[PDB]
Structure 1
Amino acid sequence: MMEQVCDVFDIYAICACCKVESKNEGKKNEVFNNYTFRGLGNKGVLPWKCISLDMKYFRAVTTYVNESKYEKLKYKRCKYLNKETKKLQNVVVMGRTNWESIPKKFKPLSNRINVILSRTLKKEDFDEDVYIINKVEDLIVLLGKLNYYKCFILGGSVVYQEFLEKKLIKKIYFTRINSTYECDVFFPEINENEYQIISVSDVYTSNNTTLDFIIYKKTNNDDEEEDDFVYFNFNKEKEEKNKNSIHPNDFQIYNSLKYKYHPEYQYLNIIYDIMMNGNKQSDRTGVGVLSKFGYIMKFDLSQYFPLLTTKKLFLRGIIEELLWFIRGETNGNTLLNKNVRIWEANGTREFLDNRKLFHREVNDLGPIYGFQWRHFGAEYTNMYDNYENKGVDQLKNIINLIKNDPTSRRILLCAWNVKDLDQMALPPCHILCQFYVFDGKLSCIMYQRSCDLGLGVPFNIASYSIFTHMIAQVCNLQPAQFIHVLGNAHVYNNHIDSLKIQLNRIPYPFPTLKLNPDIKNIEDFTISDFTIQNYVHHEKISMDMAA
């Protein structure tokens, strides 16, 4: 290498970008890409009032130093300048407008060497402990004279534009604010060939927005204990086959990422695991799956709504399904009249006949979820019957227990009624929900005996997440964790190519779910009581690719 200025001087950019108005931004038919998050500023200030978690991120990154790693950095810089060889601090560079946007109580930025770029102002115009430079070149001369750890370009847009076009940035630390505000300055459109995303953080809520932290990297375009690790892996040739192979190069992006901390990676990593280590099994008439047995996902509903972003999902159907369940309905026609076709195939004359339900009316699904939720143990007759005060009203029971016996270890909703399995159109995939209450917070475990990772699971995650919110609210609690246990976890072979596409997509910050807060009984919700805010997602995928 002919060492580059950005690598010698460790020059990084840090920014936060929200989404922008854009003539309503198309409206619902909207395309999303990394350029969706581009809003920097409005009227010489930030577009948002306070996002404290971003502020705390920005301070920790820009203040953090590692003394032991100075030796190697001084040598490199001294070598580069062909030269021989206080508390160590980072340098932070601000345009004059950026500097003027910062309230006085914050500046100069604590535990940091403050640098301001200006032509109009000179050192005589500042009271503060700051360096003025009038030239990008004077910054590089200055880093050559100073003891510092890393150099952070803090914006604004004009400063971002010139440091990027000069190829002076080695990584961009980029906050995605997943909300829309009025903006009049924007971050430069990043060239996907110059910079690639290498890391994605967990998703958080701060001040009524979700947000995450991504890292772009510029492209090329007691030691003793370490050996004991090698020894303990003398037998790792069984997972070194990765039985199925499916080729490395099909996951360049997935495998390129260094930190994969976005909760959507719980889903994508299970799909990777099944693709590389799954067992080949028969399924039905030849169809074919890769299968594994026993996974757990955990989703923090206090921080986000885990609606998958690596493809497009609609929730109207699965919400109409959940309301249908809560009503205790088994009538397929109710959903079909709402153009929800989830249960259509399971209600046909042929499907019911092949289940031996010869005496069952078309779209009479029998004693499935709804009936077990409101009437477990009652004799199923038909889908029109009035089952009032027949069987156990489980739903009512668990709402009572959450409200009056919250430390109970017996708050389960169970759909797997052994007596009734053969009368069901098909037995339930979603066996039981158990609830947990601590400190005014409701968590839900859902055990799923059979899990179609390609099609079913993304919707099942959404269903039980919404359900946790509904139970949390009618019992006066805040939603905490939704915990999803996978028994038979499988990828249909038909889905494999579609999933390969999806695995190489980078998740977006999750949306948020809003419930009408006036709804105080589980029975009183209707479709318009549910709102998904700030859903940023990749393009729709048909998992079939054929029909």
Structure 2
Amino acid sequence: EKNVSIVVAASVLSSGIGINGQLPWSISEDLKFFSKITNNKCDSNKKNALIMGRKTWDSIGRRPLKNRIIVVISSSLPQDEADPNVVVFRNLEDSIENLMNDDSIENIFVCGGESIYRDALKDNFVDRIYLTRVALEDIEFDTYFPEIPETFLPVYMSQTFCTKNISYDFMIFEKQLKSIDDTVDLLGEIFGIRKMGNRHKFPKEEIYNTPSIRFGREHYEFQYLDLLSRVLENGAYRENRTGISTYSIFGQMMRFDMRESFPLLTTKKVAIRSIFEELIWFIKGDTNGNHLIEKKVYIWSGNGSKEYLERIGLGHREENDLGPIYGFQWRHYNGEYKTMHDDYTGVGVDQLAKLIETLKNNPKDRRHILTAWNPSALSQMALPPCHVLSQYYVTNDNCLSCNLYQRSCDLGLGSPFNIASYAILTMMLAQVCGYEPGELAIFIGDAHIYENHLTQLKEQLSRTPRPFPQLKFKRKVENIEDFKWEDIELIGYYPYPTIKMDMAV
């Protein structure tokens, strides 16, 4: 018995692999990945056999690959005994004689050919599958990769990488000490909630997104999905200011990469425009909710309504005057707030300006902090800061990383919007200060799920993640307040259908 793995780069959705006898993309990192994954061996006296179709053999210019033996499947190509590195077989089955004979082969790889892939799956010869998903679908294909049968299960999903503004992943599909575990279980039986391990139980398979991927959960959307599962598992059913109770856990975190991708969820279509518009609405220090409604953004409607304002003791306030909320504390901290129409120029502390100036004039500083929690202004605010305080960090390789603490997190609505918002903000601060995006760490206090989002989020958990999109700015601005929606280019975003969820006012 010898291992036979499949290596293939297909598109994310339609699984296209070629067009007009060639690849519909040019990713050097992918070809390098193929090279290293096919050259991987233990015995130095052995080589790896590469099975490919005749047309694929024509595609590579009919030239052998070093340290490997290319096996060409063709009904016309003569058995060339000249080249000792290339061999031709009449059928796929006979080509796999490497098992019974020729001990100079350590591993067998199916490298390409839809006609080859399909009958390599149909006749069941494949043990492992190395799938390289590529994020582009608005192009033309003529050669596709056959749908993976249910006999295979994903065991690995790498982070999203970027080459020429193209997002791509690396996945592995597999055909499928006791003492410590037993001891921990026993301690979990003796001590109940006393044992902290029992307070943080591992999510069950029924609510675990892609359960088959256990040790290879490298994709950073899992940082959010596994959190969703954790709140779904250990979430204490508790009440709150709203009539809708939540299942809540305390003390969590999510990590994200922004260098090679953009942390925008693919399991659900997220309204990016509203996120950006809200972000620049903050940056300007604007507190007028109507300005968001005029631009068809209704995320501050429920927390802005006259009824809600009169209910929280702000009946004197205008229809959509949210008060000294986010942005007003960014640009005018400790500034005496009157109405949303007043001109607060020069008043208060401009945290954003000092933040930028400190970021570019003193990068290795440890005080790059933007806060929104003002005890003196909390009573005037329509809604206390959820994404409370953020800190920024300039790495040695000129990258900008962002940490955000969030006191309360709506994993259904608030969370993705926050992730994307601070990602975009980090990118803006990066471009303005002349840096590159780095990492985004979000530390969550009260991580909760509303009881009216149960079926929806459980539906979202039933979706296997896709590679993160890319976010590029079309122009470089001099002032951070000059960003426009037309200046934003979102590349390679192919998410699952949107999920309608109601906001608890």
Q: TM-score with structure 1 length normalisation?
A: 0.84
Question: Counterpart in 1 of 2:385?
Answer: 428
Show the counterpart of 1:71. none
Structure 2 CA distance for aligned equivalents of residues 228 and 427 of structure 1: 45
In 1, Cα distance between equivalents of 2:365 and 2:93: 67
Query: Aligned in 2, Cα 1:265/1:126: closer, same or farther, shift over 3 Å?
Result: farther
Alignment of 1:58-97 (within 5 A): 58-66=34-42, 87-97=45-55
| CA–CA distance in structure 2, aligned partners of residues 356 and 252 of structure 1 | 42
The answer for the alignment partner of 2:162 in structure 1 is 205
Residues 546 and 162 from structure 1, CA distance in 2 versus in 1: closer, same or farther, beyond 3 angstroms?
farther
Separation in structure 2 between the aligned mates of residue 356 and residue 126 of structure 1, nearest angstrom? 90
Matched, 1:440 2:398: yes
Structure 1 or 2: larger helix share?
1
Seen in structure 2, the aligned counterparts of structure 1 residues 48 and 247 have a Cα distance that, compared at 3 Å, is closer
* Equivalent position of 2:246 in the other structure: 289
Instruction: Give the partner amino acid of 1:274.
Output: V
Question: Percent of pairs identical after alignment?
Answer: 41
CA distance in 2: counterparts of 1:480 and 1:376, whole angstroms:
28
| Distance (Å, rounded) in 2 between the aligned partners of 1:480 and 1:333 | 34
1:345 aligns with 2:307: no
**Structure 1 range deviating more: 401-410 or 274-283:** 274-283
- 3-state secondary structure, aligned to 1:335: helix
Equivalent position to 2:7, from 6, 9, 14: 14
1:146 aligned residue (64, 87, 102) = 102
Which residue number corresponds to residue 435 of structure 2? 477
Return the alpha-carbon distance in structure 1 between the equivalents of residues 458 and 388 of structure 2.
30
Which amino acid in the other structure matches residue 17 of structure 1?
A
Q: Report the counterpart of residue 467 of structure 2 in structure 1.
A: 509
Q: Of 10, 32, 49, which aligns to 1:56?
A: 32
Give the counterpart of 2:187 among 215, 227, 235: 235
CA–CA distance in structure 1, aligned partners of residues 504 and 120 of structure 2: 47
Separation in structure 2 between the aligned mates of residue 278 and residue 66 of structure 1, nearest angstrom: 47
Give yes or no for contact 1:243–1:276 (8 Å, CA) kept in 2: no
**Aligned AA (2:28):** S
1:466 aligned counterpart, secondary structure: helix
- Going from structure 1 to structure 2, the CA distance change for 1:244 and 1:485 (only over 3 Å counts) comes to closer
Q: Any conservation in 2 of the 1:451–1:486 contact (CA below 8 Å)?
A: yes
Contact 1:160-1:187 at 8 Å conserved across structures: no
Which one-letter code corresponds to 2:10 in the other structure? C
Deviation at 1:314, TM superposition (A): 1.4
Give the superposition deviation at 1:285: 5.6
1:45 equivalent in structure 2: 22
Q: Is contact 2:48-2:109 (8 Å) kept?
A: yes
Q: What corresponds to 2:87 in structure 1?
A: 131
SS of the counterpart of 2:75?
Answer: coil
Q: Which of 389, 399, 408 does residue 356 from structure 2 map onto?
A: 399
Q: CA shift at 1:361, angstroms?
A: 1.1
Relative to structure 1, is the Cα distance of residues 245 and 413 closer, same or farther in structure 2, using a 3 angstrom cutoff?
A: closer
Whether the 8 Å CA contact 1:37–1:177 is kept in 2: the answer is no
- Name the structure 2 match of 1:496: 454
Structure 1 residues 308 and 278: CA distance shift in structure 2, 3 A: same
Counterpart of 1:487 in structure 2 is 445
- Tell me the SS of whatever aligns to 2:211: helix
Aligned partner of 1:110 in structure 2 is 66
For the 8 Å contact 1:271–1:453, the answer to whether it is kept is yes
Q: 1:425 to 1:181 in 2, by over 3 A?
A: closer
Which deviations, in whole Å up to 9, do the C-alpha atoms of 1:174-217 show, x marking residues without a partner? 10111247544322441554544343222111333110012334
Q: Deviations over 1:224-269 (max 9, x none)?
A: x764665466413458997899995634763233332211110011
How large is the RMSD of aligned CA atoms in angstroms?
2.7
> Pairwise mapping of residues 125-524 of structure 1 onto structure 2 (< 5 A)?
127=83, 129-147=85-103, 148-180=105-137, 182-190=139-147, 193-218=150-175, 227=179, 230-231=182-183, 234-237=186-189, 238=192, 248=204, 250-251=206-207, 254-258=210-214, 259-284=216-241, 287-438=244-395, 439-524=397-482
Q: Which moved more, 1:353-362 or 1:415-424?
A: 353-362
Gaps of 5+ in 2: none
C-alpha displacement at 1:125, in angstroms? 8.0
Q: Is the 8 A contact 1:399 1:475 kept in 2?
A: yes
**Is this contact kept in 1: 2:402–2:441, CA < 8 A?**
yes
Cα distance in 2 between the residues matched to 1:509 and 1:423? 42
1:247-302 CA distance string (max 9 Å, x none): 95634763233332211110011111111122222223652222111122121111
Question: What TM-score do the two structures reach when normalised by structure 2?
Answer: 0.91
Number of equivalent positions: 498
Q: 2-side partners of 1:540 and 1:499: how far apart?
A: 11
Structure 1: stretches of 5+ with no match in the other structure: 1-7, 20-35, 68-85, 220-224
